[PDB]
């Protein structure tokens, strides 16, 4: 990986335009170990740029929050709201919530990881002889 994919997700993924400190130094350094020179040339840029956006959107908004500071550390899904009289119902997430395990990492929750997950299958065939 001769070129770390930095600061292009603001142009590629247009919603993220909050901060450039809690993205490049904070998440791009965590993610880019998953990519390798063994992949295709057309995939070393978008897959890192998508898996890093998964870690952004797993938290609130790039530095964990947008301008309102309403973030829950458990990403508890919302079932139903109502604004005539204020009423919400939430989801249940303790070891795993809905077809999601408890011992792995779930890449299939947001779009940003599902676009990684179909690039991870094509470029990393799963076998070994050791």
């Amino acid at each position: 990986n001769p070129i770390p994919a930095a600061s292009d997700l603001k142009t590629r993924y247009p919603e993220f335009t909050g901060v450039s400190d809690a993205v490049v130094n904070a998440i791009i350094a965590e993610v880019n170990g998953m990519v390798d020179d063994g992949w295709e040339v057309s995939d070393q840029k978008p897959a890192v740029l998508a898996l890093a956006a998964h870690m952004l959107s797993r938290e609130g908004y790039p530095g964990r929050a947008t301008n309102p500071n309403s973030f829950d550390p458990t990403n508890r899904p919302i079932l139903s709201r109502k604004v005539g009289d204020v009423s919400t119902t939430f989801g249940r997430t303790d070891g795993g919530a809905a077809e999601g395990g408890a011992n792995s990492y779930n890449y299939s929750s947001t779009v940003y990881g599902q676009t990684f997950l179909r690039l991870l299958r094509l470029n990393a065939p799963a076998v070994g002889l050791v």
């Binding site: 170990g33 990519v35 390798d36 063994g38 011992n103 990492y105 990393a124 070994g128 050791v130």
Partner: protein, 311 residues
């Protein structure tokens, strides 16, 4: 083995002559000088492998492809015995006239290397074939005036046996292969630094497993073991060398040496069929074709040839 041995056992012991007027000693001295024992073995094998072969006689001061009898010359003059295959001869006529000696036989042999052309007459030549073709006029290929090879008929029987030897000896490497299923293996094998962290540890953990070491795995990891089956694959291996030995017409007490899987060699009639096959070569393939020999070499007992002299 199918080429050499049924032609090698026909000239092991051979040709005790009859008359002794101190003449059985120097009628063998002309054989031992020319090397007629070895040169008939080396001729029959080339006729066995290729379509045919031929040894050519040389009597001193004999010109060309004449109507050529080396029977009238009453001297002590015999020098040449060179033996050549069908590679180095040429059967370049047939002469289908149904009255001639050596009918359907080539009448002329273009044979030399380098200097000259040297038309040679067939009565100067011992003619040896592997297997006699049934319709010699309709025959084609390289062997036109020659016979057919003996790898022709036993080609299918040979390749059945040699394929199943290389297949059954391939299964012994895969005698029991085992797999190990990791839960998320798609993601460890996604870079170079991550996957060598995995495969370096599985080397040192799957090297010494066995009786004196026990594997430690997670409760998710599977480790099944797939054992192949070697049932009845040894009576198959011995039924194919029957069909090769039957094709070569050699019993398995001579083919494949003295094999322990021979259970019809009763102690009086072991190989009496195999010596009945060799005596049908000594009196049907080596006895007629040596007719311009064997009256010329008994002629070389200082020119004088008796009548009641045989072997």
């Amino acid at each position: 083995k199918a080429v050499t041995i049924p032609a090698l056992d026909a000239v092991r012991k051979w040709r005790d002559w009859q008359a002794d007027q101190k003449d059985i000693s120097r009628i063998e001295a002309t054989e031992k000088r020319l090397g007629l024992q070895q040169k008939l073995l080396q001729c029959k094998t080339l006729a066995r492998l290729w379509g045919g072969a031929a040894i050519v006689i040389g009597v001193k001061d004999q010109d060309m492809a004449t109507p050529f009898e080396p029977e009238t010359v009453n001297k002590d003059d015999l020098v040449y015995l060179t033996v050549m295959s069908r590679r180095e001869l040429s059967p370049e006529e047939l002469e289908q006239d149904p009255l001639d000696e050596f009918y359907a036989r080539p009448k002329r042999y273009q044979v030399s290397n380098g200097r000259n052309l040297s038309f040679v007459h067939p009565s100067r030549i011992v003619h040896q074939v592997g297997e006699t073709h049934p319709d010699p006029m309709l025959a084609t290929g390289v062997n036109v005036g020659w016979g057919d090879s003996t790898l022709q008929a036993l080609y299918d029987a040979m390749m059945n046996s040699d394929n199943t030897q290389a297949n059954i000896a391939s299964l012994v490497f895969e005698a029991n292969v085992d797999v190990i299923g990791l839960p998320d293996f798609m993601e460890n094998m996604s870079s170079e630094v991550y996957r060598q962290k995995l495969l370096d540890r599985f080397t040192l953990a799957a090297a010494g497993k066995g009786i004196n070491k026990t594997l430690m795995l997670d409760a998710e990891e599977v480790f099944t073991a797939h054992s192949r089956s070697f049932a009845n694959l040894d009576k198959i291996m011995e039924q194919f060398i029957l069909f090769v030995a039957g094709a070569a017409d050699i019993p398995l007490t001579r083919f494949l040496g003295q094999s322990p899987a021979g259970m019809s060699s009763t102690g009086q009639h072991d190989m009496k069929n195999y010596h009945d096959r060799i005596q049908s070569i000594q009196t049907l393939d080596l006895q007629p074709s040596m007719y311009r020999l064997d009256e010329a070499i008994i002629r070389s007992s200082l020119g004088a040839r008796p009548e009641e002299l045989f072997y």
